Symmetry: C2
Subunit: 969 residues, 2 copies
């Protein structure tokens, strides 16, 4: 009943909403799911925005807050909606959907702590008021509260659910991955690694045995995975999620009795500007069914065959219970079976790489009779048994083929059954009162016995037709097609099924006595088109051209799109020239207390910040220096540092520079810093900008080599509050009152190190391993005193005593390799902060001063620590279309690059990005001259831009197909 | 040390040999391996052919038997050769390499049976004479005898080895997958399934502790997999073999001590004409490193990184021994380790889908100091430890990066080290005499401690350089690059290394003060090029464009190819017009005895045959007839049948048709039949053509559902001769005569064993035909022995009339499954129809060479509907203008949209291959050698197999358009 895809209105240009949703509908989806992110609607703590307006430079004009329009569009296209308002959403999104002003109100995020929960009450009021009319009109059918509250806190979850129930009485309310709930329905999120089924099967089984009688759903069935900078890969951080894998998970879920399924993500789209979670790529492509740029991937067509089956047999599927009577002949495939009054499904699962030939035992009969069931490699086949065709004399005793769909056309029931090229299928039809006749088109062999017709078909690139005629004037029309044509079978309106090679059938409009269809043709979209309809078809036209039209039988017409109308086009577009202009950088600077977290000084945006530090060194300290290294320690996230107008260094979180630029008296330090967004864990406060400080002279280091792991149990359960435990870990303090080289799994780790000189400064660095977009929960204790959750480097000087000291880490979740840096001095001075850059504030991305021409390659080593604007013009002499989407590629090194097109922020790329390209949405592109603008922060003496290009992924042809209709009978 | 790729001279147009072999050379290959197929050189049992010419219509003019020229070309390009002359080769090849005349000479194939072996002695004489000069010149360094004789027969293998040792004294001689051999070296063939390492790891472990002291080699390391019609898939029958999988297998093999490895296939190419094994596609692309059309796949660049490492650290690799001195800090990756005096390798294997951060314990030191070792997902990383750079004061204590190569340039050692974009690596260099100085280009942080420099590097899209200088006269140049540029690092000779984005570097001409190299540029080939050389470079040109030249250090130059020079072209070429001509089919028909196989009538070619059957029915037979079905039963492989000038039916091996065109007296049956090739098992005789017969009136069936599996054991071992056991299964006859004990019943005959069932025969006037079922038929033919009432009938090869073995009442059938699966049923027929049979090889249009020059046909507007021509043969001629020079940098595939045909494809008179409804694709590679600039003649021969049949159209498609450009170094 719920055949759902995740599509985020906040990750899709508003004009492309229709394209993305209709592609899900055309796949047989009947529901779309989306988060409603609190920080998307209320970033500044002002008027909640549910309009098209943005107050943020980094959010392009075509991204919208108009949730009402998204919901109406879903309704108009025939989709229901699942709403996921948070307040936490995770979703690889800045602060997991928390507005960055929340960190000023509460430490105890994701709890009933009033400092947090009062703001959650006001958010739910704003958002549930917008949802209200759409719940009443039965478009919005489900509300998720919170998101993967793994740890229990039942009264937190129940309070959220009670507010939804007060505003929206009777609406289904649930959460995901909180197994400790008795009354609020729990739903599961499944992201197993390819090929071994046991972990997935075991999680489905436990979930199905849980919460007896409550709503059952997979709220996130793996539809791919996300991409990150720093530690990421293309096409996902987990490499390719095979489309074969996704289909096996879906068919396994159907085999085990889950008929409520949401693919996460179905379409991922793009992360607008600085709404990324920390380290997230600008792309949210997700290797999804619908790629970021709108492409229907192999994963789309496999999911489509499953959703089309589940949609065109909801009767049977809703009736099914767990079964055991059916058995297999061979061990070459597994069996998952379900049984209902009027039919069964046998799911034959072959996770191995060799084709399997299977038979079933159903009531002492070995089926099929003359041919085995093919189970392809890396495939699970749904086999239909004992299916009653209601209000007819027909029973489908079995098919060894795969049923796509079943449709009533007056006196005829049509079923489409598919197989591979060269597959033999066998279908047994039983007819009450006997078989009157069988008409066949193509290669069908018939055996008759009693009231049965047996049909043996050799599948090809085409359809074989069998009509089994009853004595009561009712007919069964079987259409045997290949898997490829089943994938490109399009159900338009209702009473029009197109069996084709056509890449995509979009909008349809039935006015006059005419159906107009918007087809998108790829290279392989030409050749044979079957039309299955009760409507009289007089003519089919493709632009001007009248197509050949054959009547194959009643309800079936054949035509062809000529092979010439399918093109193999793909174009690249080069800049006319490159102009350079240096950003002055400074614009608006204000005093700030040293190490004062940006969000506690009214700065709620990520993106670029500039610090000016005025730091004081005198005779005695320069005099006594034991080592000539300056350290900038504890910032989110990436900085380029200049000292006395000389480039010094760059990097993430913690940088060691040369001290040589240092003089006696005042030293000026410039920090150009990027915040890539907050993590998406939703519990910890990882402050934007410099939360740490400046240190001088590395005098040594203390490596925490070896740890004693001790049993410790976090009391996860319905009564547990994780936010309360992180803020007050009394049970750990208690355990501390009172072998392993790697701290990489849950538990309490203790080690001892020596301190000789307490005039030194001691900074614990959590190490490279610790930093992940879904931030780890690791609690730091120094000599049995709670320092806090690890968020970054931390000065632990004030917690140290002379001689033997103790460090303990309680890993609730994650990995860390800590090391202590020892510094001579902690440098002090006056601090100034700027939000943004002069060029951004002055909107140079909308209109740049004219700069100098430059011949590529553009060498930037001399501008290390500076900001360079690079403007180019690209001719694109056609209409921007979803039929021909464009990517911008930049060949550069030693830069953090912000990309704009015609003054719209497209995203960022850096040296540690998993790709050198961005999707340029059709809404940003114009026919003619296009302005491509790079803002380049220069991070190295080895730095440059070799070039850039706009690339078409493909060029598909948009064509209108017109059906001239006659009279229905 | 043997870094080998399988490339078959008989599957590559001769003009393209150089391209395929140089691409193997360029990957770091030092050896090419090839079968020499007996049936390729002696198909007709006449003068053994080692020339360019062909006796066969279906073998294009550009395929060669000139083995000498291949061996010469391999030698010229700096490659050694492993030769594998069979006599059996398997290789998805017709009869596994046996000439089809062998079936007239012997039943006991692959044995010392004289009827087989005397002909093996003549073949081995012809072929070892061709090889002798190349063994003496040290080009051919190994000879494989036989091929996967799994079952033992040591005296048979010994006898093949003796003939080789006598003609080519002291040449290395071995076989593959015969683990019962004590004296002759055995080698291993490994084709595991992605992601569980345990089966592969256990096979390697067992092999490495077999045969004390003898030659150790993986003679076939999975390079992909083949594709079949009927039961096959794209891109292989096992779907995609992931490129990450192939690299994990290679790195595992290195980590376990195997340094002799052959990738099967490195390049697969094409199966010429009817030299396919049964059911095989005309493509042998194999999803190989080099695709059939010449493309360098992702698999190629991954294998190239491994071969480059093994070549560039030869001294280290030769020295390594087992030893377990190193430990890992965490469980997120496994460790394989080898140790020598020169240093150690730690292979960190991560078969999971998450990045692992790893540390090593070496001495009592935790390695590295400031940075963890990245082990990427689905990856095995080779970490070097304690590497002594011989004749220098440098030790590489460790690098968390991956070492690609090491090269001496005068007083400087250069090492290339790689990682992913954004990877942090840590490298520890110890200098004896102490560290004079470290000069750096790029993002290299230095920590000096002892006589040690620690170098911490963020890997980028480009190179960071560190020159560590000794207080003596000697320098360590470290170049830190990304994986992608390591993959496109090209070694043009001893002192010319290009670190690049370039898709491929081909031939070089090392003139005087000029180096000219042929580059092939894809769309990502542009950007930075680094040149590492001892040579003085004044200028670098791309054709006529002089490039920017920066001197980075003494041995390192930097340049760039402008991003504008890398196009993204891709063109489709369309036919002008279609002309149709009906083949008259009949040309020359001669008498043949009913059921007499074609090889017993002097027909040794596969391909198309036409039978005319003159069958007699009298009034009585037709009057008494109980069921209206005619069956053609037992033929190889596919038939289209007409009765009294009406299309009756089509299919593989066993066809049931309507009997309604039949009438009293003579009935004229036309059978148009294709043999797709013999199977590649090399043991059984599966006859071409009609070996069964024609039956009328299907009056029932006996389903053989339920079997008793007994405890019979085939005695495999050094003394076992499997051909002798197949010919004379005496132990099975004895097992069948003894008391049965109680045993398990099964519905599945799918694993080795003796299976027994029982059925009722009520009427011995009927005819009983056993059908082995769809499951039975596989290109590598199964071995299942049929017994009826305890009498040996024979190995199953197809449907078999078993009537004469039956008695009234309860009958027994027993199957000894040596290997395979079967699901048999007995068809019961009223009559066996007798008459006179006639055979023709080919069709009128083939014999008269219409593919070389077609008569004028009628023009036809696509789509061309053929359903009214069911059972008949139609020639479709068209012209495709191709207005460029045919080139490997722009290869073409012919696509045909059709249904209900078997199609034979010719281009400019050259047989390209076959396509049918049950093909895993609708396209063929058209080699450059068949294409011409200007008008291309595309000719299809369509056997119409159905009343729903036609050709919608066809097109020539370029896979891609790369740019060919010379890079010129002025010295």
């Amino acid at each position: 009943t719920l055949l759902c895809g995740e599509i985020h209105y906040f990750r899709v240009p508003k004009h492309l909403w229709r394209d993305r949703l209709l592609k899900l509908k055309r796949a047989g989806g009947n529901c779309v799911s989306t988060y409603i992110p609190w920080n998307w609607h209320d970033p500044r703590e002002k008027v909640v925005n549910f309009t098209d307006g943005t107050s943020q430079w980094h959010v392009a004009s075509y991204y919208s807050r108009d949730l009402a329009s998204f919901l109406e569009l879903a309704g108009e296209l025939g989709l229901r909606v699942i709403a996921r308002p948070g307040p936490y959403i995770c979703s690889e999104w800045d602060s997991g959907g928390h507005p960055n002003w929340i960190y000023t109100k509460a430490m105890r995020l994701r709890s009933l702590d009033p400092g947090y929960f009062k703001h959650v009450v006001e958010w739910y009021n704003s958002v549930l008021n917008i949802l209200k009319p759409y719940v009443e009109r039965e478009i919005v059918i489900g509300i998720q509260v919170e998101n993967e509250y793994f740890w229990g806190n039942e009264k937190y979850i129940e309070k959220l659910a009670e507010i939804v129930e007060e505003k929206l009485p009777g609406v289904l309310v649930f959460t995901n991955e909180d197994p400790y709930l008795t009354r609020i329905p729990n739903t599961i999120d499944l992201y197993p690694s390819p090929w071994d089924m046991r972990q997935f099967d075991d999680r489905l089984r436990s979930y199905l045995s849980s919460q007896p009688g409550l709503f059952k759903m997979i709220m996130e069935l793996e539809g791919g995975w996300f991409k990150s900078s720093r530690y990421g890969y293309y096409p996902t951080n987990r490499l390719s999620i095979p489309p074969e894998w996704t289909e096996i998970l879906l068919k396994t879920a159907v085999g085990m009795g889950l008929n409520n399924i949401n693919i996460y993500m179905f379409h991922g789209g793009s992360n607008p500007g600085y709404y990324t979670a920390k380290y997230l790529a600008s792309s949210y492509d997700f290797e999804a069914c619908i790629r970021e740029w709108g492409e229907l991937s192999e994963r789309y067509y496999r999911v489509k065959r499953v959703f089309t089956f589940l949609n065109g047999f909801q009767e049977l599927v809703t009736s099914l219970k767990p079964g055991e009577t059916v058995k297999t002949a061979s061990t070459c495939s597994e069996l998952l079976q379900r049984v209902g009054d009027h039919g069964k499904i046998a799911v034959l699962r072959n996770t191995g790489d060799n084709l399997c030939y299977q038979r079933l035992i159903n009531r002492g009969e070995i089926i099929p009779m003359w041919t085995p069931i093919r189970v392809p490699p890396r495939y699970a086949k749904i086999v239909l048994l004992d299916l009653v065709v209601e209000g007819t004399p027909f029973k489908l005793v079995y098919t060894s083929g795969e049923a796509l769909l079943m449709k009533r056309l007056g006196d005829t029931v049509v079923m489409i059954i598919y197989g591979d090229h060269g597959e033999y299928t066998e279908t047994a039809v039983e007819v009450e009162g006997g078989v009157l006749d069988v008409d066949i088109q193509g290669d069908v062999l018939i055996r008759r016995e009693g009231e049965r017709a047996y049909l043996v078909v050799n599948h090809t690139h085409g359809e074989h037709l069998a009509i089994v005629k009853s004595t009561r004037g009712q007919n069964l029309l079987l259409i045997f097609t290949c898997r490829c044509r089943a994938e490109k079978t399009w159900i338009v309106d209702e009473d029009l099924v197109l069996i084709s090679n056509i890449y995509y059938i979009g909008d349809s409009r039935i006015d006059e006595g005419k159906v107009v269809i918007n087809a998108e043709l790829d290279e392989d979209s030409c050749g044979r088109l079957l039309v299955v309809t009760s409507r009289e078809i007089e003519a089919i036209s493709l632009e001007d051209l009248d197509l050949d039209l054959t009547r194959l039988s009643k309800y079936v017409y054949a035509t062809h799109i000529p092979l010439s109308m399918c093109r193999s086009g793909k174009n690249t577009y080069h800049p006319l020239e490159y102009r350079l202009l240096e950003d002055p950088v400074f614009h608006t600077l204000t005093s700030i207390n040293p190490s004062s977290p940006l969000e506690k000084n009214g700065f709620y945006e990520n993106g670029i910040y500039v610090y000016r530090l005025r730091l004081h060194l005198d005779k005695k300290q320069l005099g006594d220096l034991l080592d000539k290294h300056l350290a900038l320690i504890g910032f989110s996230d990436y900085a380029v540092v200049s000292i006395n107008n000389e480039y010094a260094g760059s990097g993430y979180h913690y940088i060691e520079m040369s001290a040589d630029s240092l003089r006696e008296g005042v030293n000026e330090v410039t920090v150009i810093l990027e915040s890539t967004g907050h993590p998406n864990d939703g519990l910890l406060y990882v402050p934007n900008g410099i939360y740490g400080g400046v240190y001088l002279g590395r005098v040594g280091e203390i490596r925490l080599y070896k740890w004693r792991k001790t049993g410790f149990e976090i009391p996860y359960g319905p009564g547990f509050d994780l936010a309360e435990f992180i803020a007050n870990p009394e049970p750990v303090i208690k355990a501390l009152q009172e072998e392993t080289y790697s701290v990489d799994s849950p538990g309490l780790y203790i080690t001892e190190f020596k301190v000789d000189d307490l005039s030194r400064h001691y900074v614990l660095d959590p190490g490279l391993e610790f930093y992940y977009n879904h931030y780890y929960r690791i609690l730091l204790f120094v000599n049995k005193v709670y320092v806090g959750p690890l968020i970054g480097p931390i000065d632990i000087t004030r917690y140290l005593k002379p001689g033997v000291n103790e460090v303990a880490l309680l890993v609730e979740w994650g990995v860390v390799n800590p090391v202590i840096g020892v510094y001579q001095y902690k440098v002090d001075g006056e601090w100034f902060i700027q939000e943004g850059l002069h060029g951004l504030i002055e909107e140079w991305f909308r209109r740049s001063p004219r700069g100098e021409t430059a011949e590529p390659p553009i060498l930037l080593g001399d501008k290390a620590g500076r900001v360079i604007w690079v403007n180019t013009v690209i001719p694109y002499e056609k209409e921007p279309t979803s039929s021909s989407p464009v990517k911008l590629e930049v060949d550069f090194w030693g830069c953090r690059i912000l990309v704009f097109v015609n003054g719209e922020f497209i995203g960022r790329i850096s040296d540690d990005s998993p790709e050198r390209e961005l999707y340029v949405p059709e809404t940003a592109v114009r026919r003619g001259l296009n302005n491509i603008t790079l803002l380049a922060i220069v991070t190295s003496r080895s730095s440059g831009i070799r070039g850039l290009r706009l690339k078409e992924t493909y060029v598909h042809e948009r064509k209108e197909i017109v059906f001239k209709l006659g009279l229905t009978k």
